[PDB]
Amino acid sequence: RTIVVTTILESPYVMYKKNHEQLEGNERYEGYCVDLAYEIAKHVRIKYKLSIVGDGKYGARDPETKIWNGMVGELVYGRADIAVAPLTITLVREEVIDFSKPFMSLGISIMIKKGTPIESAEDLAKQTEIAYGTLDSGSTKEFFRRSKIAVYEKMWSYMKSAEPSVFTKTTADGVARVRKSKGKFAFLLESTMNEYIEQRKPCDTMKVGGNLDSKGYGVATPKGSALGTPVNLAVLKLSEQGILDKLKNKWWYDKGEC
Amino acid sequence: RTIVVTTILESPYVMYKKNHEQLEGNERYEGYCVDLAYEIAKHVRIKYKLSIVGDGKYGARDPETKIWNGMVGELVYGRADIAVAPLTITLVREEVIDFSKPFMSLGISIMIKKGTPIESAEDLAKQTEIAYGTLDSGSTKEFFRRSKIAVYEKMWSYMKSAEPSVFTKTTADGVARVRKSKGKFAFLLESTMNEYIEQRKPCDTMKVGGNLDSKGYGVATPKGSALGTPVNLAVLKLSEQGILDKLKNKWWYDKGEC
Ligand SMILES: C=C(C)[C@H]1CN[C@H](C(=O)O)[C@H]1CC(=O)O
Ligand SMILES: C=C(C)[C@H]1CN[C@H](C(=O)O)[C@H]1CC(=O)O
Ligand SMILES: [Zn+2]
Ligand SMILES: [Zn+2]
């Protein structure tokens, strides 16, 4: 009856409210994906509880054990009914779960500390003074690992071998490292997170260049689920009523500090 | 065995080749969607024939007869196996056919003759010296007809009553009218077509402002079809190998005359 909605902490998708320790259930959280889940559940007519995925991951299949981890795995093993999170719609994920049409459009992009002499991936690639890396795991690393475009192969090889490690564990950590490296570290991350950070104090970062690819986040459900279709139509309706635009503006720009 | 792929003439998606009258079958045509259909059919492993939809329409349901027209209707009535066209992924369409994940991202946008004093929808809305309209039918008209955002309601009402008619029958006609109206007509059309035209002689138009919405084109198949899933994974794979980016650059920018 009460559906399980798996999600994950990632600003401004899902964040603890100010006095979350005094709160219970869904009231503990706020953010874009909290509002989205509310709006979706309103259209599909379901009661639900948000659960933070236990292992803090998005969804990948271990090559050895073949187990899917993260929110994807919660869905694959039947421990959750829906995942509402900045979950990149990728082929390997689409093979084992169902994604709604994108609720947000995005692309891989470059974050620099203001003043860094870099405008594009090409600038990064033809040098090593300024180091650069992606998150340790996730779709961006995967984009680079799999590319057959020369510029991107060049970048993957560099990152793959760079010492010490150019990869970071979280968005926060990548941002901290740009911010501390005095212009000697650029972070490669989804354009959505990049744009959000740009609008946050100390306002010392910026997104430069166009995106490297074009993709989307989708709401995910287990294959064969009876919520699959209604959730899909819910996203499209929300997109069409301008609610997805309204929410993005709310969480990214209305609150903008720069 | 040989699957029917319904499509439609619309530059640079599908166009007659130079000597099409001397050619047969699929060889008559070229463009982005011709290349896409080739690439998809290669991954899904099917032989196919491109058929130009008979009634020159995309897909809407007549309110009186309840018949679906256009490429959508070819799919709904079983006369075609797949539609590969700049077919906007919309809720009313998604209710009766299956769309792949978007192969192209886009939004409603503004086309002006160079020099026109207009930067945004707001500028258009607060005046009448410069007339403006959309295609007679299609998803853009529908966006305006259904909006509950004030600026857009204002624009729909104006367009709805403007004399003579601000609506045009085709992309070509809308472009011609901008081009001839000496800065007194702006055309509201999908950002994809807008960007393509901007790169064509006489180079006297331009896209101004951001887009009014965010959506995509999807490849469409009948509900319950066994090609639905493989086509969906085909688009994602192509997106992921950078083939959709390569094709867009090919048909929009490589050939750019401005
Ligand atoms: C925040 C993380 C780790 C997620 C969010 N979208 C990607 C995902 O769905 O894999 C990841 C980021 C990226 O790989 O840059
Ligand atoms: C070219 C046309 C009439 C099509 C293409 N995409 C929209 C569709 O799928 O409805 C239409 C354009 C638009 O309404 O501005
Ligand atoms: Zn706390
Ligand atoms: Zn001809």
From Swiss-Prot, chains A, B:
Subcellular location, in the record's words? Cell membrane; Postsynaptic cell membrane; Postsynaptic density membrane
Q: What does this protein do?
A: Ionotropic glutamate receptor that functions as a ligand-gated cation channel, gated by L-glutamate and glutamatergic agonists such as alpha-amino-3-hydroxy-5-methyl-4-isoxazolepropionic acid (AMPA), quisqualic acid, and kainic acid. L-glutamate acts as an excitatory neurotransmitter at many synapses in the central nervous system and plays an important role in fast excitatory synaptic transmission by inducing long-term potentiation.
Q: Per UniProt, what is the name of the gene that codes for the protein in this document?
A: Gria3
Q: What family does the Swiss-Prot or TrEMBL record give for this protein?
A: Belongs to the glutamate-gated ion channel (TC 1.A.10.1) family. GRIA3 subfamily.
Query: Which residues does the entry place in the Extracellular compartment?
Result: 117-258
Q: Would you tell me the protein name for this molecule?
A: Glutamate receptor 3
Of the intact sequence, the residues represented are 417 to 799 of 888
Name the source's superkingdom: Eukaryota
Q: Which residues bind L-glutamate?
A: P86, T88, R93, S139, T140, E190
Q: Which cysteines are joined by disulfide bonds?
A: C203-C258
Species annotation: Rattus norvegicus (Rat)
Further notes on this entry? The postsynaptic actions of Glu are mediated by a variety of receptors that are named according to their selective agonists. This receptor binds AMPA (quisqualate) > glutamate > kainate.
